[PDB]
Amino acid sequence: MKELIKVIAFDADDTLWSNEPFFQEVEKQYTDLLKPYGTSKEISAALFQTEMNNLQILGYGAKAFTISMVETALQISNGKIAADIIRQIVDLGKSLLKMPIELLPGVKETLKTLKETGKYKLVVATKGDLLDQENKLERSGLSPYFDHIEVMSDKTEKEYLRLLSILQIAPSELLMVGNSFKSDIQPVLSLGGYGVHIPFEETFAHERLKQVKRLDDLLSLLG
Amino acid sequence: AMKELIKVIAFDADDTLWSNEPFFQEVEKQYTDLLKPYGTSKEISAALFQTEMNNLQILGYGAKAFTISMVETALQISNGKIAADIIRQIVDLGKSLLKMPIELLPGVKETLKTLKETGKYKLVVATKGDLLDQENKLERSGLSPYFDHIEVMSDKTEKEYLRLLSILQIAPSELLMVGNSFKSDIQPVLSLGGYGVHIPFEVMWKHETFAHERLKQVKRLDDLLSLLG
Ligand SMILES: [Cl-]
Ligand SMILES: [Cl-]
Ligand SMILES: [Mg+2]
Ligand SMILES: [Mg+2]
Ligand SMILES: [Mg+2]
Ligand SMILES: [Mg+2]
User: Fold this and answer.
1) How many CB atoms lie within 10 A of CB A91?
2) CA pair distance A109, B137, nearest whole angstrom
3) A188 CA → ligand 6 middle, Å
4) Which of A151, A172, A37, A19 is nearest to B150 (CA)?
5) What residue ranges of chain B are covered by domains with CATH 3.40.50.1000?
6) B-chain residues within 8 Å CB-CB of A89?
7) In this structure, which ligand is nearest to the CA of A130?
8) Distance between CA atoms of A56 and B50, rounded to whole angstroms?
9) According to CATH, what is the number of the domain A20-100?
10) Which of A221, B55, B170, B225 could disulfide-link B59, Cβ–Cβ 3.0 to 4.6 Å?
11) Which InterPro entries match (chain B) (predicted)?
């Protein structure tokens, strides 16, 4: 921590700001549009199937989500769905790209304090559409605290190794902070790095892992 | 002269390493053919371009953005009249861009293989567009072994080239950028203090730049090899 960690990487969505609630409300509104074709659970299962079938070419993010929404609508309706439902679906997807940014507790004070130490390089480590993530950061007001954003095509060990290489450090010099144990924490621990898990409201404990309730609790862990 | 300064050689990908525009053009032609009832190809293309530009600050560049704009333009220009079957065809067109065959341009494989074999540089791709799509393209191209890093950019202005330099941890003076687009690939790097090799893309047979101290213009990518030897 003292003279091991050089880089503190932060997940963005549900770590720096709320994201999943906005997405889930969009998914709810989508499933309301496809009522004739199934229960909300059923429509969500079909959409997830499409997302998974599209994963290798579309990847992650709001643009991918929008395209899978349109496809699933076309599919489940046997290509008979009204064009106006398609217009609504595209509008829903675009709402995701203009979502207002609501910072989570302690985020602003933590990043300011870390910036003012001048001790760590601070980066955002996120999947998704590059422009979207860039825009979210800008409108969060947090851009002055961050050296830059690393947008990733996935969050497996392979992509974290690419991140480490780009940053010119070894795994033991990286601290990753995020809400997802599976995507933000596990892969980084597996490589040799450190994690702070901040759940957003199945895991295991680990010597290079701490779980905290809110992001500002990070500051005592560094001291 | 330049050959001792350079630490990183960045390449544009589309229409530099492989042919891209022809396939995008053929998808757009098929699009206009689908929307023939609502306007001339010239008219359909103009409405599409206007949508792309109005969506640029939230959708940006690349095949996903294009798909979404093709859909939105079809809906708007048909005043909602268009059938779902046609929207499905449009989505499949956009997705066809993500499975495009990669056809390497002249001298590309030999230039990159030779440069990698010197051990002398970091070789990177510097490209706009969707990150996954550009990684998939590089993988399908067979060229991935020669590149240290793909840098996907949200635009190709001085601001984004400074980001790249900062990420690479080098000075403008230590970057050589190679690309087919003088406006996007070459001028911004020259303006920051970097070097450029302009390699015009000719495959379009379109009906028919300046000289600069740190610019070379070449016809074929492997021409690069003797600028650096
Ligand atoms: Cl993420
Ligand atoms: Cl580009
Ligand atoms: Mg997250
Ligand atoms: Mg991959
Ligand atoms: Mg190009
Ligand atoms: Mg795109």
Assistant:
1) 12
2) 41
3) 28
4) A151
5) 1-20+102-229
6) none
7) 6
8) 30
9) 1.10.150.240
10) B55
11) HAD-like_sf (IPR036412), HAD_sf (IPR023214), PGP-like_dom2 (IPR023198), S-2-haloacid_dehalogenase (IPR051540)
